[PDB]
Every structure is written in structure tokens, then in C-alpha cells.
Design an enzyme around this catalytic site. Structure first.
Site, PDB file in Angstrom:
ATOM      1  CG  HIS A  98      -1.880  -1.050   1.336  1.00 32.27           C
ATOM      2  ND1 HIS A  98      -2.746  -1.345   0.300  1.00 32.27           N
ATOM      3  CD2 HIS A  98      -2.180  -1.923   2.349  1.00 32.27           C
ATOM      4  CE1 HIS A  98      -3.510  -2.396   0.662  1.00 32.27           C
ATOM      5  NE2 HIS A  98      -3.180  -2.748   1.910  1.00 32.27           N
ATOM      6  CG  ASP A 152      -1.340  -8.175  -4.099  1.00 34.75           C
ATOM      7  OD1 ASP A 152      -2.067  -8.693  -3.227  1.00 34.75           O
ATOM      8  OD2 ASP A 152      -0.777  -7.047  -3.947  1.00 34.75           O
ATOM      9  CG  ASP A 205      -2.728  -8.453   1.273  1.00 34.90           C
ATOM     10  OD1 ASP A 205      -3.786  -7.847   1.608  1.00 34.90           O
ATOM     11  OD2 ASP A 205      -1.746  -8.517   2.012  1.00 34.90           O
ATOM     12  CG  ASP A 227      -4.274  -9.559   4.441  1.00 37.20           C
ATOM     13  OD1 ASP A 227      -4.184 -10.201   3.338  1.00 37.20           O
ATOM     14  OD2 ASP A 227      -4.024  -8.322   4.577  1.00 37.20           O
TER      15      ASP A 227
HETATM   16 CA   LIG Z   1      -4.606  -8.835  -3.581  1.00 33.65          CA
HETATM   17 ZN   LIG Z   2      -3.842  -6.981   3.284  1.00 38.40          ZN
END
Ligand SMILES: [Ca+2]
Ligand SMILES: [Zn+2]
Ligand SMILES: Nc1ccccc1NC(=O)c1ccc(-c2cn(CS(=O)(=O)c3ccccc3)nn2)cc1
Ligand SMILES: Nc1ccccc1NC(=O)c1ccc(-c2cn(CS(=O)(=O)c3ccccc3)nn2)cc1
Ligand SMILES: Nc1ccccc1NC(=O)c1ccc(-c2cn(CS(=O)(=O)c3ccccc3)nn2)cc1
Ligand SMILES: [Ca+2]
Ligand SMILES: [Ca+2]
Ligand SMILES: [Ca+2]
Ligand SMILES: [Ca+2]
Ligand SMILES: [Ca+2]
Ligand SMILES: [Zn+2]
Ligand SMILES: [Zn+2]
Lengths: 369, 367, 367
Positions: free
Chosen positions: C134, C167, C169, C257
Site C-alpha cells: 500500500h 497479489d 493478499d 490476510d
Molecule cells: Ca490482492
Molecule cells: Zn492486506
């Protein structure tokens, strides 16, 4: 039934001094003695003064060179021995102090004398609170300990006993005892201790012994904060299974009090009743038993613990109200024998304790039958 | 009425523990054949269980133990003597041909049943080849190698906050109690013979630990308990457990070694007295997995589990056995129900009342 | 065997975001100690990362922002209140002791891995302290301060014409997609929860701009996606991307996560289901940098990244966890693998196929 107890104490032991700020205080042995005199426990036991164990006795285990150094080193000649001090790990945790060698001789003399008495069947139980110095190694001091009185007492027991069980409830791993017997099946060593970035660094449950000693070393690694209920739920089951599988004919119990709540150096949360439950458990097996001291740095609680464990050994109920004694002000502000646990968190979950117990039980299945 | 899913693999009766061993998987095939001949198949969905994988078994058992069970064979035991000692395999839990597949089929049925209950696709699931309550994480025990009950309860726990396990086998369900001894998410309740009897555990004082304190319940009994003495403790105990614990699913192990005339057991229950337990449990209208267990007089096991399946289906079945592939085994009477023996009931009224009152005191300690 | 090098600094676990903050660098130390106790150190090269320099960080980040991170301390926060606001530091991205050093070590591992891959000294590089996707050019966001992924990708692009970023996540990888949104030399592919969820970007319709049109791919999902559903869209999407884009290096952010039971996340993937993504990417035999990312149930983050390290090594490891420094954190079961929950999967089969078809239409627009 009720047992004969022989108890060893030298009235000079409390005068040995490790030095300013050192947490090991031999004076705790004299407080213990004074407290149990004042409860009247001397009526019920034979009190003996240990002999000074000789160099012949100590080199049944330790090297001749190390025992010669310990006989020789003094605060006035330290400067001439700077090299030997390094080699034998003397001079910081294990300082040179006046009368060092004599303190080792008296600590050792009570343990070996008690082992003799047991071997002769003159007593069911022998107690030496000045003993229990489990960190000392064959040729070096460690962890405030210089001479391993426990290894020497076990060697004495091995003259008459094929199998000897050693149980160590000090908060630290009993590493010097386990190392001495690591490759034999004639001594099973069982240590419950805090493990993880803690002194002395050993006692993983995967340390199980080696060669003929494989499976005859048992380590129960614990985290901070253990309390009476967590301890009491693994100790009777492990010791019962060990007794069943190994069938010792004598037992040595190191009752280090640094596992109590409020210890200056230790991180556990046991009460005196929790700690003493271990003595009660071991006593039920009715085997010749040598009970020894060990660590313990909040000295008012050491004295309470070892007084109450002497009373347990004697099957004697003593009142919670402490009798007056020479050290009475040390026991304030409550002047009671029993202690309360602190509100510290127990990092030992009930699942963790059962899981470790199940892993050790697997190992105990590998003993012959 | 209520829907019943029933699990059976036609191969299960071919596994053989060895000459002289009292455990006989063929009792399951007898059971199945009697129930088919009573017409009880018209009333339930019959599924062949998939074999549980080795990976499914390691949700509870240790990998080294399951790899051992998968590897050991009668002809290779000399290479595995240390592991046989470690895992307690080779004596009362022998090595036999197909051992691993027998464990996969018994577990498969229990786990499949739990999945069907979690999905709300049935009200009751039955696996008579399940119930092997003695097996431990890393050791065989008491003729059991893989604990299908534990694995089924782990599966129920995905969908149920509280699961109640009730065990009417004559032996203490020690492997199940040990698995859940420190949790409040499973309450285990075992009635069993206690005192110089296998496996040695299940004292009145064993009530659980940690968050599981008060969530393990043991009713230790002596020899000779009869239908009246047993039923007068079972119903009030289970009623109070249901009240205090409020489970959302129930697993009932219906070991038939608590029947009168069992080869290894010393209880005096009849089929009706044993099945009364199933009836009591059903009155609470909770999702229910019914499993098998011990039982060594095989003609009485087949009668017992046949009658309990009929209780599950709310079907009265006649006392006259229908013709079946094993008909001669049930002579010379050929009846479903059995008579108790004249053995002495060694559980005094004072004894039973003292145990029941302690258990009620323990049950009042729940939140 | 493909060679694996792995980065870890022993001080990483001691950085602390502050009381109550869900991000816990200690999880990296847990992961490390678990894979030591599984014995996996024997199979890989373990390196300590260097502290990335300000010169390295300003290959992407603004000089002003890096200078602020290198200055700001709990004891001087009063004097930097306007800069804290400008750079978005002080709330969800708190100031803590050693902040800059933590950024230097997380970045050092990812850039060092990329250097090793470019020099063809390893086939896979792993940095579980990285994946901080991020962070933006001139501001912190979402617990991330320095975008180690963007810096690693800029290092890869020295030697590789086309780099693929994947990605997994649960959050959209917004800082990485933004850095590369107008170039075709990086294709970014993110699977994430989308709809009133942090960071609010990653719509299916955000497909890149300029020369980068069609080189950003976003698969928005709803709560409760499970292993079955995720794995049925991940393999065909990644395979089509590999066919059309033909990257010469791959960066895979393995934010944990997305696991079932995560303190902040809403998906229902197991460790096996998350790790299948690593297995799929490895089948393409391209230089691969594997990085960490989110994950807030720290016992399950250690399980996930330990198993993904084993998958990178082509090593199966047993489900029974070895004893380790943090063994009590893995109760009650002390197993490596986790079970999914009973949460509803809000991603219907038609939703997944429809979104897959829409992405496949965009991928067909590549040269
Ligand atoms: Ca992701
Ligand atoms: Zn995350
Ligand atoms: N266990 C024990 C028994 C009998 C006599 C002495 C002992 N020694 C101890 O109790 C002990 C406590 C602390 C430390 C230590 C060293 N650096 N930090 N802590 C070392 C040893
Ligand atoms: N309970 C149970 C349930 C499901 C499957 C098997 C069982 N196992 C038993 O029934 C059982 C009976 C006897 C003995 C025994 C051992 N030494 N003497 N007797 C051990 C176990
Ligand atoms: N994705 C990720 C990767 C690597 C390092 C950290 C991250 N950050 C996160 O996981 C994350 C979780 C929650 C929130 C949030 C903010 N307001 N409400 N929730 C913001 C960010
Ligand atoms: Ca100890
Ligand atoms: Ca030994
Ligand atoms: Ca039972
Ligand atoms: Ca329980
Ligand atoms: Ca792009
Ligand atoms: Zn100690
Ligand atoms: Zn039984």
C-alpha cells in the site's frame, strides 16, 4: 505410613557470602532451619551435621584439576589465577569468596552423607537443604554452583541401587545432573523447567539421552507464569508413568524454590502448597528418598517453602501462623507460612501442558518391560 | 418424521483380525443383512462411505503414526519392531492384511456422516463400523487404530458450537475423552465398567481440565448392571446434561459389549435396555451421529444394532427374525430380543445414588 | 532442484507498531522459528538483508518523504505535526521506535532478492518481511511506509523486459498497481475483496492507462471465498496471463490476510488453498520473488508462510508441528494446516465465471 527423616544442617552455612549484590544467599538455609526449629519440627527428626566432603569424595565425579583449583583459589590470590578462573568459569556468576571450598564441602557432605544413610537403610528420607547445586559440571562451575553434590550423592546411591530416579522442580534445567548421566540407563533424570531464552539454555523436550541412556532423560519445557493447577495436572501423571516404566529403587528430588511466585530471578507462579504437592506425590511411592535444596532468591519464601516441605516429609501439619523466630521481620507484612500467587499471566495453556505430556508419554513407551 | 442416512461398505466384513481375536468385522455385515431383511432399507438412504484419506486422519493423529499404519504389513514387522513398540501395534491391536483400508472405511463413514449433518441434509447418520473410541493421537489401543469419533467431532465443530458425545460401550471412551479433555466445545459423557478393567481410566473424579473443567463426565459402574438400574441413571443424567450444556449436535457411541452374554463384557443389559438410550437421546430432537463400538457376541451385536436402527427410524419391528443370510446363527429361538442372565448386580442402590448425586453437583458448576 | 534463497533479520520481530495495532512483525520471527524447527534451513540459503539505503528507496519514493521517515521519532513528533499530516504518518501508520530501520530491513530483503534473481544466482528468493503493497510514492498507507515491492520490481526491470506481479493478499495491491499503471513492462494482477473495503480500489474496470492499458488486472471478490472457488479461477487466469504476456520474472505477494480466521480479513482460504497459488506459479519455471504481506492471526501467518517456504523447496512437511519457541501459540490442535469455517461463500459460481470471462476478454486485447 510415617517415615524416618534424617536432616542435615551445618550452623556455619549461613555465614558464607557470595558478595555484594549476588542473589545467592546461603543465609536462607539458616532462616529455613530457624523457622522449622521454631515450629518444633526438631522433635520429630534426627538432625545431623554434615562432614566436610574431601577431595577424594568430590573427584568421584569432578576432575582432579578442577577440585585442586577450587581448594586453592581465594580472594587474596585471584590475581595469580586469572587463566584458571577463565577455564573453570569462576569469577562472575560463580565468584571467588572467602571459604568457597568449605561451603562446597558442607553442601556436598550432607548430600553424600544422606545417600550413605539411605544405602544402609538407616532412614527412609534424608534432607539436605544446602544441596541441590545442579548446574556444576565435571570441570567447571556454572550458575552459582561449583561442586555437583547431586551427581556425587547419586553415584553413592548407585553402589546399592541398580536404578535411581532424579526429579528436578527447580525453575532451571538440571543440566549438570542430566549431562553426567546422559549416556546411562542407571539414572533417569526428569526436569521440569522454564525453557526459551532462559538459563542455562538446555532441556528441550527433544533431549532424550544418548547411547544406552536414550530415553532415560525426560525434559518438560514450560513458559512463564505457571501456576499450581497447571503444574499439579502434569506432575503426578508424568511421575506416575515414570515410576511404572522405570521402577527405580531410590529417588533424589531437587526442590529448588526459584519456581515459586515472587522469586527475584524466576518467572513462575507456584505457591508453597503447589511446590510441596510435588514432595507429597513423590513420597507416596514409598521409596528411599533424598530431598535437596536448589535455587531460590526471595529468601523469606525459600524459608517458608523448605520448612513446609520438611513438615510434609514428616507427615506433620503445621499452622499457617508463623511462630516467632530470629528472622521474624523477614516474613512481614503478613507473618504467615503460605503465600498467594501473583496476577501474572500463565503463558502455559492447558492444551500446551497436555500436548507436552503426550509427547513425553510417547518417549516413555520406549522403555523396556 | 426424521431422515436417516446410513453408511456401509460391503467390504467391511472381510477384514480379519486374526485367529482367536475377539474383534469380528463380519458382525457389521450380519447387522446389515438382518436390517435389510426387516425391510429397513426402504426407509433410509444407504451410502457407501469414501475411504478417509491419510491426510484427513492427520487432522488429529500424528503423521508418523499414520505413516506407520499405512506401511506396516504382516510380512514386514521385523523392520518395524521399534515403531510397533512406540505405537502399541502388534499384540491386542494386531497387524492384519488391509489394516489401513479397514481404518479408512470405518473413519470414512463417521466423517461422511458428520458432513451430512453439518450440511443439514439429514437428521441422523449411522455408521456401525465406527465407534473406535480407544485410539490415541499416536498409539493404537483396545483393538482401535484410528479414532473415527474424534475426527467426526472435529468435523461437527466446524458448524456446531457445542457437541455432546455419549458413550454406552462398556469400556471408558478414553481416546475421545482425552482428545477433548481441555475444551468446553465438546462434553464427553461415558458410562462404563470401572475397577481392574480396561482401559483403567474414567474415574468419577476425572472431570476435565482448563476450560474443559466440568465438561468430562464419568459414571463408573461395577459388574452386572441391569436394564432397570442403568435406565434409572441414564435418563436423568442425560436430561440434566442437555439442560445445562445445550448442545447443538450429539454423537452417540452404541458399543454393544455392555449387553448380557457379551464374550468380554460383564454387564447385564438387554437389547431393549441398551436401545432405550437411543430413544432417550432422540427425544431432544438434535442432529445425531450414531456409531458402533465394541461387541463380541456377534449374534447379539447384530440384534442390538438392528433394533437401534429401527428405533432411529421410529419403526416397530417384530420379535420374529426374518429369514436372512445368517439365520442359523440366531437359533435355536430366532427372536430379536434377548433375556438377561442371572448374574448378580454389584452396583448397590447406595453406590448408584452417591455417583449420581456427585455428577449432578458437577453439572451445577456449568455456566 | 531449483535453488531458494531466503532473507531474514533477527531484529525484525522486535519492531512494535504499538499497543492494540494489528500489524505484528513478531509473526516473521514465528515463521522463521517454525521453519528452523521443521529442518528446512538445510535446504536453503539463508541471508541477512542489508539495511536498504535512502538512495535505494528514492529510486521510487520522493526524497522529501524518505528524509521525513529517517527523521521522525516518538520523541520529536510534536515538531513534525504538519509533515505527519502531509505523509500520512501517525494514525494507522504510527510512529514507533526504529520505524526507519524496520523499513530498511523489509526493503533490503526484497531488493537483495531481486539482485540475486537478476544475477541468476537463485531461481527463487523469499522475503516474508516484504510485500508492503500500500505505500505510495510520497505517503504511508495501510500500515506500509516504503513500497519494497515497487523497489524490487524496479530492480528486476533492469534485466527483464516484462515482469508479472501477482497479489493474493485480501487487499487490493494499490501502491504497486499505481506505480506501474501506465506501463506495459509490468503487468499487475490482484485478487482481493472489493466493496466498501480498504483501500477502495481494484475495480474490474481498472485496467491500466496509456501504454499500460490492459496491463493491470483486478479480480474483485466477496466475503467467504474458499479454496475450491479461488483455485478454480486462479489457475486459468494466471495461465492465460502467462500465455499472453510472457513475462521473464514474477513477483508473488503472499499476504496471509486472505486466510480463514484472519483478524481483519473476510475470506475462508486454508493454508493449502493459499499455497496452491505458489505451486501454480512455480509450474512456469520463471525467476520468482516471493514476498509476505498482510496477516493478523499470527499463528496462521506463521503456518502459511512456513508451508509456502516448503512448497518453494519442493518439500512436504508433516502436519504435526515440531516443538518450537512459540509452540503454545498453535493450540489447541498444534497442527500446521487449518480448517475452513462455516462462513457463507458470497461468491457464486456464476459470479466467478462471469468475472473470469470479463478478464479473459481484456487479456485477449494484448499484442
Ligand atoms: Ca490482492
Ligand atoms: Zn492486506
Ligand atoms: N538453579 C540453581 C540451583 C541451585 C543453585 C543455583 C542455581 N542457579 C540458579 O538458580 C541461577 C539463576 C540465574 C542464573 C543466571 C545467570 N545469568 N542470568 N541468570 C543462573 C543460575
Ligand atoms: N471398547 C471398544 C470399542 C470399539 C472397538 C473396540 C473396543 N475395544 C474393547 O471393546 C476392548 C475389550 C477388551 C479389551 C481388553 C484388553 N485386555 N483385556 N481386555 C480391550 C478393549
Ligand atoms: N494489505 C497489507 C499488506 C502488507 C502490509 C499491510 C497491509 N495492510 C492491511 O492488511 C490493512 C488491513 C486493514 C486496513 C484498514 C484500514 N482501515 N480499516 N482497515 C488497512 C490495511
Ligand atoms: Ca528443573
Ligand atoms: Ca540418564
Ligand atoms: Ca462407555
Ligand atoms: Ca471436554
Ligand atoms: Ca501495468
Ligand atoms: Zn534454579
Ligand atoms: Zn468396549
Amino acid at each position: 505410613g510415617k517415615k524416618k527423616v534424617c536432616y542435615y544442617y551445618d550452623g556455619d552455612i549461613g555465614n558464607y557470602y557470595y558478595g555484594q549484590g549476588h542473589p545467592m544467599k546461603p543465609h536462607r538455609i539458616r532462616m529455613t532451619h530457624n523457622l522449622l526449629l521454631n515450629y518444633g519440627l526438631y522433635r520429630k527428626m534426627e538432625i545431623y551435621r554434615p562432614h566436610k566432603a574431601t577431595a577424594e569424595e568430590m573427584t568421584k565425579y569432578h576432575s582432579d584439576e578442577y577440585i585442586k583449583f577450587l581448594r586453592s583459589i581465594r580472594p587474596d590470590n585471584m590475581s595469580e589465577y586469572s587463566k584458571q578462573m577463565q577455564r573453570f568459569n569462576v569469577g562472575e556468576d560463580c565468584p571467588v569468596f572467602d571459604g568457597l571450598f568449605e561451603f562446597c564441602q558442607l553442601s556436598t557432605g550432607g548430600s553424600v552423607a544422606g545417600a550413605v544413610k539411605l544405602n544402609r537403610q538407616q532412614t527412609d528420607m534424608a534432607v539436605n537443604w544446602a544441596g541441590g547445586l545442579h548446574h556444576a559440571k565435571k570441570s567447571e562451575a556454572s550458575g552459582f554452583c561449583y561442586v555437583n553434590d547431586i551427581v556425587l550423592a547419586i553415584l553413592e546411591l548407585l553402589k546399592y541401587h541398580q536404578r535411581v530416579l532424579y526429579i528436578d522442580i527447580d525453575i532451571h534445567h538440571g543440566d549438570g545432573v542430566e549431562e553426567a548421566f546422559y549416556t546411562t540407563d542407571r539414572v533417569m533424570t526428569v526436569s521440569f523447567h522454564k525453557y526459551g531464552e532462559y538459563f542455562p539454555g538446555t532441556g528441550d523436550l527433544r533431549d532424550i539421552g544418548a547411547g544406552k541412556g536414550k530415553y532415560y532423560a525426560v525434559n518438560f519445557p514450560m513458559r512463564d507464569g505457571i501456576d499450581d493447577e497447571s503444574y499439579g495436572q502434569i506432575f503426578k501423571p508424568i511421575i506416575s508413568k515414570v515410576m511404572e516404566m522405570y521402577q527405580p529403587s531410590a529417588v533424589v528430588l531437587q526442590c529448588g524454590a526459584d519456581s515459586l511466585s515472587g522469586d527475584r530471578l524466576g518467572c513462575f507462579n507456584l505457591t508453597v502448597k503447589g511446590h510441596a504437592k510435588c514432595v507429597e506425590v513423590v513420597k507416596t511411592f514409598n521409596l528411599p528418598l533424598l530431598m535437596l535444596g536448589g535455587g531460590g532468591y526471595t529468601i523469606r519464601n525459600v524459608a517458608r517453602c523448605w520448612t513446609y516441605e520438611t513438615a510434609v516429609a514428616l507427615d506433620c501439619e503445621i499452622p499457617n501462623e508463623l511462630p516467632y523466630n530470629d528472622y521474624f521481620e523477614y516474613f512481614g507484612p503478613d507473618f504467615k507460612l503460605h503465600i498467594s500467587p501473583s496476577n501474572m499471566t500463565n503463558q502455559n495453556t492447558p492444551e500446551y501442558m497436555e500436548k507436552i505430556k503426550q509427547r513425553l508419554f510417547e518417549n516413555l513407551r520406549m522403555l523396556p518391560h
